[PDB]
Symmetry: C3
Subunit: 271 residues, 3 copies
């Protein structure tokens, strides 16, 4: 099997092209670069510059007003010095965001919207290619709880798989590596595309038709990670979950995402 | 902003003094030393000596009778040698305790009581300063599930925040460090005071008016850590939790501590 | 106290022999070698060879057809190279297994059956020796959710206790070490016996009459680990759980394994 990380044009997928190739990719690899999805280097650049600015030229006070009382990295700014001197982060979602100023909010709301739109659209194709209809319908499933995290830096990360439906990654030596065909392959930047990692929820909802590839950071740079995560009430078949590898401890025939993962979102699971 | 860890007299807080300063501290720092709270070096010393004694001169049999069948460090004694040769521990709560003898129980029951009393009292001030009324009332909220852990030693601990309402710490080179104003500051001993770390539950119950500071152990000594933890049925607003940074995966408008954290107490969360 | 890891003949235990010695062992140590339980080097060898073969001479395609879409190590095969170059694994349960071929399935189904039979039988003796009757009865309790994991290799593992009822271990320098009498002792191979670690569920169900010993891997070799895990609906008394060390955050007088551990099986807990 070719261990190459494939690339797909979202527009072409929406047009019904490369359906066999896309299915095979999802099943055998669970990752790919996505082009023509409204996300390019330009957009990244705009949000990139304004956030970096804040990181470097932002005061401790301004950063304070955009720092959550709990260091959950869910919203706002996150960090003998601190760990920001190791890496700084900025997170946001559909609501309850913390923006340092006018120009920042405009650029980042726009950026998030594009990321969310692309994520839902590719996730939509993942569902169609596998003939999947989530309990409660597709749109209810995709109107979910995304989380966008941007990190600016000055092994690093253990091998894990994501627990999202899909995860979209943009970046600026190749850091990120993912397991393909039984070996960790390089995942370099593509100014013209976004890197897509399928997560465990894609595996679950499609009844195991989608692989959730393990990945990690090999030993300055920025990364934008967008987790498309299901709602707490996303429901699925327990017996089906058991059929594709989930070691669930759930009584009954049906369960929710909340029943399975608990009361706090968990984005990754080490492997 | 002054990055100094402030000190407050419990008696003065109960008298209604320094309310603005206390609120600001809770909001901007989430930690402080507390004096006049019935806890001094003397009391610590008494419990300190009798436990150390047990650690050093206690037989493997006596320690066995006070060791739980599961190494949870919830109650009793905890440890080519073992890890006690790295650190020994003794835990206790409101009930189901394991005491090695008469004099030990008397001293430690007394010590625990004082720690619990001080913890509830300062927690009570945290609630009043932020105009907070927990669902179900203040006293029901404070009559909870505390855990006292004493550790005797011969990085060390990753950065984390506590998931308690408040955590009281007494100790005997500065080991403990906490993030203040974006930098890990030293938290030396104060024979006249107890160090107070606000936990995530303080953040949650007050609607985000209290910060839960990250802390860790920098590279012999003893430490007494008292976690004031809520009851499993402590209830809170989900939308409100989301407003202050909690990345909750909870369906519905209200939830309990058990719904959020699960069926086993979790005292800390790495950050 | 003799810190020797005792050995018991399953046949003799079933005959009612060494009941005091067995009780003491369970209470003071929580581990022992078990002979005459239908598990010897021969059986291990047969499954050992056919799996090793697959690991070494198995293609990436054949291994692919027996690899779950999510790297949970629940069923099937698990792994600039990958981590299989560090260790390979093969898991199975009562159903939904992934077998690479005819001879493999026959040998491994037979092997699993023997492991499951032995596990239930010794677990049955653990319950009888401690006069324990699980809520819902013994057989309903033992007809559970076992997990068998076989690992082939080319510190290593932090100290932890298992959350199983009992865990059966077979292996081929002494790697495995367990805490006995306050010190990590060697647990060498015994071609004539299987090593049994009591888990936290044994502690819980028997009301704290059984210890769950901490263990770890000290710094080629194969290991077969069989976790006898309860069903999600296994029910127990909350107050009783609190009495033997479980730091439970459960409202009410009764709870299930699912309530306690959550929606995904957790096999170990670091200590
Ligand atoms: Fe990831
Ligand atoms: Fe802490
Ligand atoms: Fe284990």
């Amino acid at each position: 099997m070719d261990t190459t990380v494939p690339t797909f044009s979202l527009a072409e997928l929406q047009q019904g092209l490369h359906q066999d190739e896309f299915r095979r990719c999802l099943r055998d690899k669970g990752l790919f670069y996505l082009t023509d999805c409204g996300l390019t280097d330009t957009e990244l650049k705009s949000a990139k510059d304004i956030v970096i600015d804040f990181f470097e030229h932002g005061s401790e006070a301004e950063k304070r007003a955009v720092t959550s009382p709990v260091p959950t990295m869910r919203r706002g700014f996150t960090g003998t010095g601190s760990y920001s001197d190791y890496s700084m982060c900025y997170s946001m979602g559909t609501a309850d965001n913390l923006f340092p100023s006018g120009d920042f909010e405009r650029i980042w709301t726009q950026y998030f919207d594009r990321q969310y739109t692309a994520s839902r659209a590719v996730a939509r194709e993942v569902l169609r290619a596998t003939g999947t209809e989530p309990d409660g319908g597709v749109e209810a499933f995709l109107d979910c709880e995304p989380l966008l995290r941007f990190r600016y830096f000055p092994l690093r990360m253990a091998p894990h798989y994501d627990l999202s439906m899909v995860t979209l990654i943009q970046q600026t030596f190749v850091s990120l590596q993912a397991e393909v065909g039984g070996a960790f392959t390089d995942l370099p930047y593509r100014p013209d595309a976004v890197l897509v990692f399928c997560g465990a929820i894609a595996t679950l909802v499609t009844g195991g038709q989608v692989k959730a590839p393990r990945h990690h950071v090999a030993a300055s740079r920025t990364s934008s990670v967008f987790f498309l995560r299901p709602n707490a009430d996303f429901t699925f078949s327990v017996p089906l979950a058991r059929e594709c590898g989930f070691d669930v401890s759930l009584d009954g025939e049906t369960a929710t995402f909340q029943d399975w993962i608990g009361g706090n979102y968990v984005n990754i699971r080490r492997a």
